[PDB]
CSV table of C-alpha atoms in Angstrom, one decimal:
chain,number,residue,atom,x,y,z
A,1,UNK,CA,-43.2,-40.2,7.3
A,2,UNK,CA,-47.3,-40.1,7.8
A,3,UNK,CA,-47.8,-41.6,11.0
A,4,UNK,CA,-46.3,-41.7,14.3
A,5,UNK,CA,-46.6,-37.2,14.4
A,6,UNK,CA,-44.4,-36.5,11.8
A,7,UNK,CA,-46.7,-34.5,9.6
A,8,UNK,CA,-49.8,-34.2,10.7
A,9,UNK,CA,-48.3,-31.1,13.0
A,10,UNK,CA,-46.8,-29.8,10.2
A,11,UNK,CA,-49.8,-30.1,7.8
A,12,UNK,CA,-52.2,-28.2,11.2
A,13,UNK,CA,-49.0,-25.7,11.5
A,14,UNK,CA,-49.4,-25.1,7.3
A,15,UNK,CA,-52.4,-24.4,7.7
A,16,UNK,CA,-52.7,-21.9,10.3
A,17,UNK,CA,-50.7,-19.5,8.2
A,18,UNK,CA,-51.6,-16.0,8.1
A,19,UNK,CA,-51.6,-16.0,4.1
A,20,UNK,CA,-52.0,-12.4,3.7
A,21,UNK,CA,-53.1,-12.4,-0.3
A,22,UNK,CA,-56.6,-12.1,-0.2
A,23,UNK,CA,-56.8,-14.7,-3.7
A,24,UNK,CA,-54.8,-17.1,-1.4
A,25,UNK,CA,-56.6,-16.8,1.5
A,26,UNK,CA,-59.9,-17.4,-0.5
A,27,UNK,CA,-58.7,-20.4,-2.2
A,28,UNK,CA,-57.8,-21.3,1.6
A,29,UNK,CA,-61.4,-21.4,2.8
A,30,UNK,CA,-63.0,-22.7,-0.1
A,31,UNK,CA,-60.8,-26.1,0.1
A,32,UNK,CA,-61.9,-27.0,3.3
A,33,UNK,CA,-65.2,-28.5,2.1
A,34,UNK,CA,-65.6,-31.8,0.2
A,35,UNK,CA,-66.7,-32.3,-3.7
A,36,UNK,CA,-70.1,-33.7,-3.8
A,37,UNK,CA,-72.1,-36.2,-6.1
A,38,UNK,CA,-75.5,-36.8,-7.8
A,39,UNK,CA,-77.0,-38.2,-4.6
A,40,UNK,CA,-75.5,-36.0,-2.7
A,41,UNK,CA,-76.8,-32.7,-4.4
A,42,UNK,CA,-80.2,-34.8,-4.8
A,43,UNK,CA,-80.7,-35.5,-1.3
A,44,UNK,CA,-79.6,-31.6,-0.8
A,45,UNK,CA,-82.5,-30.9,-3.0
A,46,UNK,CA,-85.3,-32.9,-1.1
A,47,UNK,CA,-83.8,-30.8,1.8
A,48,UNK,CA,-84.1,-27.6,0.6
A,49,UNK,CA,-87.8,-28.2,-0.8
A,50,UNK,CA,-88.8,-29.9,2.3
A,51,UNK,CA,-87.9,-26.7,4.2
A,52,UNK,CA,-89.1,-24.6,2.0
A,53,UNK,CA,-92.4,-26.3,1.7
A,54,UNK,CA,-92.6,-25.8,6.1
A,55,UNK,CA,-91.2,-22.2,5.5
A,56,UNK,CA,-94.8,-21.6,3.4
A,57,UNK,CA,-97.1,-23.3,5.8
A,58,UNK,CA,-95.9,-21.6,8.8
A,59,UNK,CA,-96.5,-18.3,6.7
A,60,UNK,CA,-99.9,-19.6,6.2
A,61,UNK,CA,-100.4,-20.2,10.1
A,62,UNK,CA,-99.2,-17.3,10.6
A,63,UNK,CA,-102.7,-15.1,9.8
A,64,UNK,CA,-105.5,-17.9,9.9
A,65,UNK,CA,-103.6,-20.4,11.6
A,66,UNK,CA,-104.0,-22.4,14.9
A,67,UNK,CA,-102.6,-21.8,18.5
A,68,UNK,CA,-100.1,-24.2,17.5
A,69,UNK,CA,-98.8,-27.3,19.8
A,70,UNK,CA,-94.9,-27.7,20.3
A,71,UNK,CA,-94.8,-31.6,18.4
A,72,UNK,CA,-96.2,-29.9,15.4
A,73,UNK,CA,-94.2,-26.2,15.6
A,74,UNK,CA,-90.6,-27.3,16.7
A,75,UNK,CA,-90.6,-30.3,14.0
A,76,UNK,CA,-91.6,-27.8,11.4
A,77,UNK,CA,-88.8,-25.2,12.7
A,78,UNK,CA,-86.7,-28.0,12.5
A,79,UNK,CA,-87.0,-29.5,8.8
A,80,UNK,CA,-86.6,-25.3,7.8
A,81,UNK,CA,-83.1,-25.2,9.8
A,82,UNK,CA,-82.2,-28.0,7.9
A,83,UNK,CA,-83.2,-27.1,4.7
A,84,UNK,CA,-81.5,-23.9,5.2
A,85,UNK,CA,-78.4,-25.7,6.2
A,86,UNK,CA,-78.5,-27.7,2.7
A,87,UNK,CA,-78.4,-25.2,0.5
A,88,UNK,CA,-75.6,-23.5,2.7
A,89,UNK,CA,-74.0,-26.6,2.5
A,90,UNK,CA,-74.5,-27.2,-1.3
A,91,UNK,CA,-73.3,-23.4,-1.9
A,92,UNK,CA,-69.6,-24.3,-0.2
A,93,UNK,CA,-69.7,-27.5,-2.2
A,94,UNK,CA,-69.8,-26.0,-5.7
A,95,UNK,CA,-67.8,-22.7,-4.7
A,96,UNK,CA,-65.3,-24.0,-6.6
A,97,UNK,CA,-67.0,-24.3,-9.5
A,98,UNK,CA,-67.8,-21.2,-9.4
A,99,UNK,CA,-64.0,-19.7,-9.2
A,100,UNK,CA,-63.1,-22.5,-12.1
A,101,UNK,CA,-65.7,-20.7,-14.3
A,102,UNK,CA,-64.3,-16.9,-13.3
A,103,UNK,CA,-60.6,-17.4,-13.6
A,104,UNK,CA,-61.2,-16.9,-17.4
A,105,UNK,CA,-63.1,-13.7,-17.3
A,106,UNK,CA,-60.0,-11.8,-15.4
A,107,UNK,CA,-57.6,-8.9,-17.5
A,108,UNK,CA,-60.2,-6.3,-18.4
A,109,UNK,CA,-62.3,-4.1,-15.9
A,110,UNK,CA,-62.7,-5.8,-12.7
A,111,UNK,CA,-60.5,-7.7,-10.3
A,112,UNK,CA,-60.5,-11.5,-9.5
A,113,UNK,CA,-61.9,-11.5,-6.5
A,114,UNK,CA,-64.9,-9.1,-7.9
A,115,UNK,CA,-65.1,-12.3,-10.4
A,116,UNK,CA,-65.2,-14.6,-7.7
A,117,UNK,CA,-68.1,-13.0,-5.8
A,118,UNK,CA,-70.0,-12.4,-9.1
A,119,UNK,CA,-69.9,-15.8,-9.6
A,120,UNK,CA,-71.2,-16.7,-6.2
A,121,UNK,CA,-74.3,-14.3,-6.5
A,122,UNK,CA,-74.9,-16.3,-9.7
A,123,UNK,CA,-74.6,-19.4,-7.8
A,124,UNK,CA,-76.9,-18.4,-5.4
A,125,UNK,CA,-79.6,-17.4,-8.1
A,126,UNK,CA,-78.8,-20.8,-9.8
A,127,UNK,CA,-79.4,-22.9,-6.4
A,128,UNK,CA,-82.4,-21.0,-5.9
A,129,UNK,CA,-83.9,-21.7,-9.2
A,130,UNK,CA,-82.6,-25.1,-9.7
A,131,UNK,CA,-85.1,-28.5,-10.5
A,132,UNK,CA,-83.3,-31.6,-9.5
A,133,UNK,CA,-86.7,-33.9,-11.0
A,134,UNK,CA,-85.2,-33.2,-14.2
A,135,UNK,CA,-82.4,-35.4,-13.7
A,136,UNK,CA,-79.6,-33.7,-15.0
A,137,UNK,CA,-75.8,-32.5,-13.2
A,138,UNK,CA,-76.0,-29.5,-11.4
A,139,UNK,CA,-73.1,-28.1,-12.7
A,140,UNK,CA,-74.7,-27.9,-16.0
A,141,UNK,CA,-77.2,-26.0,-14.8
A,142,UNK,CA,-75.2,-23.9,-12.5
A,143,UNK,CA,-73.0,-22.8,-15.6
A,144,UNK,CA,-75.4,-20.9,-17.2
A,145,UNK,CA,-76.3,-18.7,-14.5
A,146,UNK,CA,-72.5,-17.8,-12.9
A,147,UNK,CA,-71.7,-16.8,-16.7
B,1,UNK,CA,-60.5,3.4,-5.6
B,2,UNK,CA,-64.1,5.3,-4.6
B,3,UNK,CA,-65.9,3.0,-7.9
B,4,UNK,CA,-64.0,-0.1,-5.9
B,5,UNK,CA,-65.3,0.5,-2.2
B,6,UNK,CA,-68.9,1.6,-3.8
B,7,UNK,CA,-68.8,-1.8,-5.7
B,8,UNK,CA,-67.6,-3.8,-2.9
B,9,UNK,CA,-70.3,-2.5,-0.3
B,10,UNK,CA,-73.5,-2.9,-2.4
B,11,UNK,CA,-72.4,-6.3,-3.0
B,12,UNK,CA,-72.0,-6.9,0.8
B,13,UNK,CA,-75.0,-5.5,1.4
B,14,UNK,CA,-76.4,-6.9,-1.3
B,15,UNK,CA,-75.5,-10.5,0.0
B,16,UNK,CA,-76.7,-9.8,3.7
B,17,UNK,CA,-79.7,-9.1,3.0
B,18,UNK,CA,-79.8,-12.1,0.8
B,19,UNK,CA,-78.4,-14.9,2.7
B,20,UNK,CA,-75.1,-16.3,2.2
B,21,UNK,CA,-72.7,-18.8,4.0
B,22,UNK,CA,-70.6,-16.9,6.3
B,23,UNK,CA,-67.1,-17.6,4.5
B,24,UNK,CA,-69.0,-15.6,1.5
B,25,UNK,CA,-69.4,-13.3,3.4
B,26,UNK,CA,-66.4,-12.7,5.5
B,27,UNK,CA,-64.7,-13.0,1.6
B,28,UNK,CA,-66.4,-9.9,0.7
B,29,UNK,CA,-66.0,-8.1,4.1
B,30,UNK,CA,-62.2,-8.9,3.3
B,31,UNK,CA,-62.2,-7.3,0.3
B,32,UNK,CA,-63.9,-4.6,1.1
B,33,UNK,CA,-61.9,-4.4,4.0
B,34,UNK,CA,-59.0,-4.0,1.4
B,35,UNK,CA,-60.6,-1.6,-1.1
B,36,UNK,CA,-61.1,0.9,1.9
B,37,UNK,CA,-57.3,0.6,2.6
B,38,UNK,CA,-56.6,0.8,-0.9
B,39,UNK,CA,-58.6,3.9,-1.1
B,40,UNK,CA,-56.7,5.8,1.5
B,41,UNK,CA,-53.0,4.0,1.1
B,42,UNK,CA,-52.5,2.6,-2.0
B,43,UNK,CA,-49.4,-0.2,-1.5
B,44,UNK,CA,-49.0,0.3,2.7
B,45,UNK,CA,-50.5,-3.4,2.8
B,46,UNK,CA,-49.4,-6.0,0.2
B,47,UNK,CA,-49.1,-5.2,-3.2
B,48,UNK,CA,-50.7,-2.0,-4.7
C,1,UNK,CA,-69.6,-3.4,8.0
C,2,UNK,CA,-67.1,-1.6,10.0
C,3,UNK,CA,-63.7,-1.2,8.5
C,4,UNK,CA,-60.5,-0.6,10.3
C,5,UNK,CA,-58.4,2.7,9.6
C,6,UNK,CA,-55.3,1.6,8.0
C,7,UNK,CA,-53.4,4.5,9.3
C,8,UNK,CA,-54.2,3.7,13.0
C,9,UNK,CA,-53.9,0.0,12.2
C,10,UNK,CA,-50.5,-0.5,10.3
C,11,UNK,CA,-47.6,2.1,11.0
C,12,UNK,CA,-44.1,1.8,12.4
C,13,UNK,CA,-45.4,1.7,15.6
C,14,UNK,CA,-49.3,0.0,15.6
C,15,UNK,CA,-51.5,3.0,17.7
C,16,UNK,CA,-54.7,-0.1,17.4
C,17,UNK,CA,-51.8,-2.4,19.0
C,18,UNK,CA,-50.5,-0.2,21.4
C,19,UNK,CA,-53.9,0.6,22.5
C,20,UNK,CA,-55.4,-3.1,22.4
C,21,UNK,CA,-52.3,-5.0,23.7
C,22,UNK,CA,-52.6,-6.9,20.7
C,23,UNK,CA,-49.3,-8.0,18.3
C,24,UNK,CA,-49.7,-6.3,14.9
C,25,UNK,CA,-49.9,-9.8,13.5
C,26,UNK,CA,-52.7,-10.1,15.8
C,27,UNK,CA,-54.4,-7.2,14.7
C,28,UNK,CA,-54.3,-8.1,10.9
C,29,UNK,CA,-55.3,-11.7,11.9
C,30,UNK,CA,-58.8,-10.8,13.1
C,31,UNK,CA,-58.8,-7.3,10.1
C,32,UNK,CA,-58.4,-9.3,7.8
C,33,UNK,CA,-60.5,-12.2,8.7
C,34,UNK,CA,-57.9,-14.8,9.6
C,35,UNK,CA,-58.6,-16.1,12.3
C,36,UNK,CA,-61.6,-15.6,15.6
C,37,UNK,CA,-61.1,-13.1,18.8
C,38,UNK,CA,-62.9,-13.8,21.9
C,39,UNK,CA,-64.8,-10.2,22.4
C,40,UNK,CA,-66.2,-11.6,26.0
C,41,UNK,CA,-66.3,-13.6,28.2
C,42,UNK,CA,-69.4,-13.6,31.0
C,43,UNK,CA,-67.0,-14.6,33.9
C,44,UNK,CA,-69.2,-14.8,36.7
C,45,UNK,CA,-71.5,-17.0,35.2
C,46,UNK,CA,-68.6,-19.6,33.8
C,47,UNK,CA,-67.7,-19.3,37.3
C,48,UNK,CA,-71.1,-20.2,38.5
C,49,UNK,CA,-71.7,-23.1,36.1
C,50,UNK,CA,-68.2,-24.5,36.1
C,51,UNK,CA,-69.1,-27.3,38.4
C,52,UNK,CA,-72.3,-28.7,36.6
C,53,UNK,CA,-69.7,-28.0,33.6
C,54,UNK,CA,-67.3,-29.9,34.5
C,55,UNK,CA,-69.6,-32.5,35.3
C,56,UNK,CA,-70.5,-32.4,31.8
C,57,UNK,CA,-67.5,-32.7,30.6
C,58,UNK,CA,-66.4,-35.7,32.8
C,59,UNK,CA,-69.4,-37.5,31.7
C,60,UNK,CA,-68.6,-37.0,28.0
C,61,UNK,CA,-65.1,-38.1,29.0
C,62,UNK,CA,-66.6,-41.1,30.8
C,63,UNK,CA,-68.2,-42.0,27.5
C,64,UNK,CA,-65.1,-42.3,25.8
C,65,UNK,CA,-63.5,-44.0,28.2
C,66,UNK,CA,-66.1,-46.7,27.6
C,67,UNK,CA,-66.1,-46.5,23.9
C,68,UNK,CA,-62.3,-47.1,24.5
C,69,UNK,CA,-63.1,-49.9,26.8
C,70,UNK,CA,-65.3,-51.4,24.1
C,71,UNK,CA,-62.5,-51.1,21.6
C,72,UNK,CA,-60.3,-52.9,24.0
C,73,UNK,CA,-62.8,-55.7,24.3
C,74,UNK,CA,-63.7,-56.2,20.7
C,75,UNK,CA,-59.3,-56.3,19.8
C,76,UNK,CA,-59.3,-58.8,22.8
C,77,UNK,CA,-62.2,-60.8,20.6
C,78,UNK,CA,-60.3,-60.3,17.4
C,79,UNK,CA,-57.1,-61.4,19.3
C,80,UNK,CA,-59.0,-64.5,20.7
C,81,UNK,CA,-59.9,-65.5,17.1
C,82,UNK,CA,-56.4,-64.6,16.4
C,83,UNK,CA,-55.1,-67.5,18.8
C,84,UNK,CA,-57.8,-69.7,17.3
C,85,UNK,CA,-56.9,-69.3,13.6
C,86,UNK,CA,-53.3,-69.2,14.2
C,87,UNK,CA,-52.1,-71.1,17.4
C,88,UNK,CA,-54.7,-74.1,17.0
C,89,UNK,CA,-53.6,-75.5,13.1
C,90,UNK,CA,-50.4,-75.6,11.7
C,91,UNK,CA,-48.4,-72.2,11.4
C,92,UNK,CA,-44.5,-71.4,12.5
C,93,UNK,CA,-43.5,-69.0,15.2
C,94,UNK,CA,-43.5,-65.9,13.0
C,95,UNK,CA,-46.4,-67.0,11.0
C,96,UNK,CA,-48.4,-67.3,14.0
C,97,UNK,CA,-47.1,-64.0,15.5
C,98,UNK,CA,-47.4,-62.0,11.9
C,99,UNK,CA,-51.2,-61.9,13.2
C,100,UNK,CA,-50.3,-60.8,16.7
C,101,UNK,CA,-48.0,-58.1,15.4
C,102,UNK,CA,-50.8,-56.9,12.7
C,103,UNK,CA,-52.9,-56.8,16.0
C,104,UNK,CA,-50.3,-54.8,18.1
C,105,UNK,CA,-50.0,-52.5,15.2
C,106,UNK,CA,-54.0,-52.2,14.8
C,107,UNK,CA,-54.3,-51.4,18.5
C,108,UNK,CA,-51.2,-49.5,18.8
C,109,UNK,CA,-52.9,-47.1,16.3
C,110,UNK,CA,-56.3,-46.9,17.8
C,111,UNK,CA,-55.2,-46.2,20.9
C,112,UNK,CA,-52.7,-43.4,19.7
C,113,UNK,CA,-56.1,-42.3,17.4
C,114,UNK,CA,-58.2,-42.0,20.9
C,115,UNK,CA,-54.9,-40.4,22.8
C,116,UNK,CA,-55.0,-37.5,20.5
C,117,UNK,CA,-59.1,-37.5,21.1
C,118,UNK,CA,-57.8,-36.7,24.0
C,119,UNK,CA,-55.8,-34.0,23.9
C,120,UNK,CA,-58.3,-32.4,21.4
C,121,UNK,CA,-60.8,-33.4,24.1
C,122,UNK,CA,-58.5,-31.3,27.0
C,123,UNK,CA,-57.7,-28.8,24.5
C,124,UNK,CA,-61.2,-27.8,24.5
C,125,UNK,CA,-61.6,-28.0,28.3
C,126,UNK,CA,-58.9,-26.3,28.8
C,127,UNK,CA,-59.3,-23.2,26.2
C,128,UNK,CA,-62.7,-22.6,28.2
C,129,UNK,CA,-61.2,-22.7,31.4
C,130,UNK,CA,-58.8,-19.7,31.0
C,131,UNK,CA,-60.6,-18.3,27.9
C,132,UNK,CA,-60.4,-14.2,28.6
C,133,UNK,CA,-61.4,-11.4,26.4
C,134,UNK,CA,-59.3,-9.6,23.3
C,135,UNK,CA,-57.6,-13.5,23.1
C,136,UNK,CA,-57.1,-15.0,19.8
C,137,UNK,CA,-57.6,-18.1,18.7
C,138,UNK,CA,-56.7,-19.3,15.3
C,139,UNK,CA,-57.7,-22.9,14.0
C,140,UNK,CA,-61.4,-22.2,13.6
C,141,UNK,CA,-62.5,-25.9,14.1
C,142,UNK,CA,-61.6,-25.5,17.7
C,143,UNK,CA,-63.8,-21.8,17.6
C,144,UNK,CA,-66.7,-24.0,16.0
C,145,UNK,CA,-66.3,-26.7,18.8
C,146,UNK,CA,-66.2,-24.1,21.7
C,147,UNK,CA,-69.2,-22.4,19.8
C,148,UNK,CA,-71.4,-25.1,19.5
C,149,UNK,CA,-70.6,-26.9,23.1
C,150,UNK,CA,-70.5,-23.3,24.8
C,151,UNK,CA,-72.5,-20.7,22.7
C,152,UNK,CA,-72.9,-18.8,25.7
C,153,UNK,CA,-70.3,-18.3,28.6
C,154,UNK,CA,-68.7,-16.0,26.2
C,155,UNK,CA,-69.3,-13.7,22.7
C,156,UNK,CA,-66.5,-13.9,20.3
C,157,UNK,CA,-66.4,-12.7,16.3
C,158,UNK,CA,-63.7,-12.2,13.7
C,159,UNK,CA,-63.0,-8.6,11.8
C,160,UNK,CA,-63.4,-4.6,12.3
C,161,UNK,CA,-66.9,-5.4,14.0
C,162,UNK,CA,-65.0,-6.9,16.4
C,163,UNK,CA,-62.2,-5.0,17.3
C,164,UNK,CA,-64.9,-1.8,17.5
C,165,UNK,CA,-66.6,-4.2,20.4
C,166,UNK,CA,-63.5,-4.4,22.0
C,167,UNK,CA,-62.6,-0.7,21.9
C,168,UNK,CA,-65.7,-0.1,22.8
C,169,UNK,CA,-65.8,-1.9,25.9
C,170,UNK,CA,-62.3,-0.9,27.0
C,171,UNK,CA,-61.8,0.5,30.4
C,172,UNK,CA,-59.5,3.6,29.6
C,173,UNK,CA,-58.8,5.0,32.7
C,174,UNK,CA,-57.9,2.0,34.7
C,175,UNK,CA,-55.9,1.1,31.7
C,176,UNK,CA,-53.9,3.8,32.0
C,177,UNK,CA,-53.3,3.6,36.2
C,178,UNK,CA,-52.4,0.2,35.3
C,179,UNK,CA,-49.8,1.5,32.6
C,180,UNK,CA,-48.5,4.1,35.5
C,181,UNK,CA,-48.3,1.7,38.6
C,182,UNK,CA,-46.4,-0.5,36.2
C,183,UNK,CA,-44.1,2.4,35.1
C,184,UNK,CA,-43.6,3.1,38.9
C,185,UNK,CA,-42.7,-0.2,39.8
C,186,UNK,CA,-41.3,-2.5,37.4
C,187,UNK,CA,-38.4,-2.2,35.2
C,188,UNK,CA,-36.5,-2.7,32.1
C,189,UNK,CA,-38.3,-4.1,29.5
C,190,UNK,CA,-41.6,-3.9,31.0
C,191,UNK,CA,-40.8,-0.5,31.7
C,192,UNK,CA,-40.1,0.5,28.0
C,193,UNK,CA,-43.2,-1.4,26.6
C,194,UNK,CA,-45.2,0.5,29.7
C,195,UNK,CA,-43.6,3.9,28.5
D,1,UNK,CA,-42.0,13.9,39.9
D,2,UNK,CA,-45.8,15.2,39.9
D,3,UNK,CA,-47.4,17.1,36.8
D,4,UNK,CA,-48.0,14.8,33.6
D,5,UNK,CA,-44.6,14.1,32.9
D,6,UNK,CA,-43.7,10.5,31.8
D,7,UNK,CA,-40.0,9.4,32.7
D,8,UNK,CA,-38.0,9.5,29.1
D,9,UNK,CA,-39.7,12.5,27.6
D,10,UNK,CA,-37.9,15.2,25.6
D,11,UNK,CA,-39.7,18.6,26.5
D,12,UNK,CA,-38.1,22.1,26.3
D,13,UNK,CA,-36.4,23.7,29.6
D,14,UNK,CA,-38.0,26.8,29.4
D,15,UNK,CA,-41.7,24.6,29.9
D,16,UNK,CA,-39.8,22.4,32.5
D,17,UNK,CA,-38.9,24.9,34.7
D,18,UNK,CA,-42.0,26.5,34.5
D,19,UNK,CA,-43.7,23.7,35.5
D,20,UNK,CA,-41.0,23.0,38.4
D,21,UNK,CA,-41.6,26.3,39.6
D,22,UNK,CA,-45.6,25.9,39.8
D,23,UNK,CA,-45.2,22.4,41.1
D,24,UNK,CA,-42.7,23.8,43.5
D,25,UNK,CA,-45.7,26.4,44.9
D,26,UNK,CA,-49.3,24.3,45.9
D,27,UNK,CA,-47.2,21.6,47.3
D,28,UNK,CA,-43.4,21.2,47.3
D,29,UNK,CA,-41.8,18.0,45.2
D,30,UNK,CA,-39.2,18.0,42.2
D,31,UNK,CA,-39.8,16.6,38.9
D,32,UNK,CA,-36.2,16.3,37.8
D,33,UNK,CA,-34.1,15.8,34.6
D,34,UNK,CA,-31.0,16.1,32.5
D,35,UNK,CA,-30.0,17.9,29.5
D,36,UNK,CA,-29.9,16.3,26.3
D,37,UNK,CA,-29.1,16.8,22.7
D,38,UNK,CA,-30.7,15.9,19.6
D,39,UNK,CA,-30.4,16.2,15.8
D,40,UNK,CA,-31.8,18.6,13.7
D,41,UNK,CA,-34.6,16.3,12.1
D,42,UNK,CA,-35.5,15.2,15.8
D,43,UNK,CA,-35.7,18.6,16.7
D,44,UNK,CA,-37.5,19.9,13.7
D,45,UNK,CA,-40.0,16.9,13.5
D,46,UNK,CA,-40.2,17.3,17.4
D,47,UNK,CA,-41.8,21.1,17.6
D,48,UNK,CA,-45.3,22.9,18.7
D,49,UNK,CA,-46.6,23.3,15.0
């Protein structure tokens, strides 16, 4: 049943499949990555301003700056990586948003897949442009810019 | 096919020079991958 | 990015596969970006460090022998307030052992949970030991654990990119005195794959 | 036997013997073989041009 290795072999062996539509294969990769919440995507937020924020003062230490000590240069390289790392992490979170919003578009001119990827430069502009002191859902906001 | 594989590879190029999450990426390799494949043999892998 | 030549790739027979001692599957596994190929491997230097390594490695193993041990010791708590709840007031026989078998059960579970650690655990270990180049690996989490405990000891990538590394470090003419001391001295099967 | 000739290779006498008789001459050794037939699409997809 579920325990004992009856399925858990045969849910790893499922998914090492070589799934040779490229559609398939894509909806493959996006499901390995959990939906996310307010807080979450809020937290993600003060993450990716925080790095952003270090990103601009190491710019401005860069000409005019100071011969700068390793406490306050490897904390500062730090906070960026892990901005960064946010709004990777927040991209692979809404992916699927962004293929919910393109399945309707499909029939006429381009491919799915050229939907899909249209959508996620869309997403990117939206994450990169989005205000989460406003309050409101991302997806919301996120909407606009895939269509 | 040539429209398809010029598409495909200014969006790649496009996103690189962006910054993207890899599986993005290696999406639109894949299906640029495909539209080169398609360009030369139309149908020799999966459906045409 | 690179793109592999779908003529030299997928035929009747595979010229890419013939010439990389790779499977067609294989071949459309890392194309296609299905799975991760280990371009390299620096062998010397894995040699070198394998000791300290596997030092490393026992440690960590260490440490989950004594998170197990802790385990074992806070079920041996639970099972001493098991005795005291149950053994001490008024209960029956199977009453009082419905909490030892929920126990059994509870441990039974945590210490299949930690076995298969362990096999993940020696998995890992294991894959680095006889990791060699043009190998594939599918099942990226284990890629992203080797990656991120061994970024070095070895440079490994997934599509076109990567098969052009591995052409491109391919030694050609020992390849081929390989292919003809083979022909010369083994048979059958061998000998037809060889030809 | 000696010149470039893999073991299970189709090539026409007239080549072969050639070859035996220049492999023959700057050092004696055989490179032997056997007739064999094949059909008209092997032998038309199997040709110089």
């Amino acid at each position: 049943e579920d325990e004992s290795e009856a399925l858990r072999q045969a849910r790893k062996d499922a998914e090492l499949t070589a799934s040779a539509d490229s559609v398939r294969a894509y909806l493959k990769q996006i499901g390995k990555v959990a939906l996310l919440n307010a807080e979450e995507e809020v937290e993600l937020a003060k993450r990716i301003e925080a790095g952003l924020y270090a990103t601009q003062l190491m710019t401005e230490l860069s000409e005019r700056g100071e011969k700068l000590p390793a406490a306050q240069r490897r904390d500062m390289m730090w906070i960026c990586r892990d901005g960064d790392r946010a709004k990777n992490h927040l991209l692979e979170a809404n992916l699927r948003l962004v293929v919910s919003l393109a399945k309707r578009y499909t029939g006429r001119g381009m491919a799915f897949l050229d939907l899909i990827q249209e959508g996620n430069l869309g997403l990117i502009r939206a994450v990169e442009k989005f205000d989460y002191t406003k309050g409101y859902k991302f997806s919301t906001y996120a909407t606009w810019w895939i269509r | 096919l040539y429209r398809r594989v010029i598409n495909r590879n200014n969006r790649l190029k496009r996103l690189i020079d962006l910054g993207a999450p890899e599986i993005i990426v290696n999406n639109e390799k894949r299906m640029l991958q495909e539209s080169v494949d398609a360009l030369f043999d139309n149908g020799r892998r999966g459906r045409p | 990015a690179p793109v592999t030549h779908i003529w030299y790739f997928k035929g009747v027979p595979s010229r890419l596969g013939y010439l990389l001692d790779l499977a067609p599957k294989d071949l459309e596994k890392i194309i296609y970006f299905a799975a991760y190929v280990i371009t390299s491997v620096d062998e010397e230097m894995r040699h070198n460090e394998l000791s300290t390594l596997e030092a490393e490695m026992a440690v960590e193993r260490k440490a989950v022998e004594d998170q197990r041990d802790g385990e074992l010791e806070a079920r041996a708590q639970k099972l001493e307030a098991d005795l005291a709840e149950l053994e001490a007031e008024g209960a029956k026989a199977d009453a009082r052992r419905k909490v030892r078998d929920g126990g059994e059960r509870e441990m039974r579970q945590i210490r299949d949970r930690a076995q298969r650690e362990l096999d993940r655990l020696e998995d890992i270990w294991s894959t680095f030991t006889k990791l060699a180049p043009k190998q594939l690996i599918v099942d990226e989490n284990l890629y992203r654990e080797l990656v991120d405990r061994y970024g070095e000891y070895f440079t490994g990538a997934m599509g076109a990119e990567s098969i052009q590394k591995l052409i491109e470090n391919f030694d050609i003419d020992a390849e081929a005195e390989s292919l003809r001391d083979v022909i010369r001295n083994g048979k059958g099967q061998k000998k037809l794959r060889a030809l | 036997g000696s010149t470039e000739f893999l073991p299970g290779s189709l090539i026409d006498r007239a080549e072969f013997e050639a070859e035996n008789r220049r492999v023959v001459a700057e050092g004696g050794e055989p490179a032997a073989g056997r007739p064999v037939l094949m059909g008209i699409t092997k032998a038309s997809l199997a040709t110089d041009s």
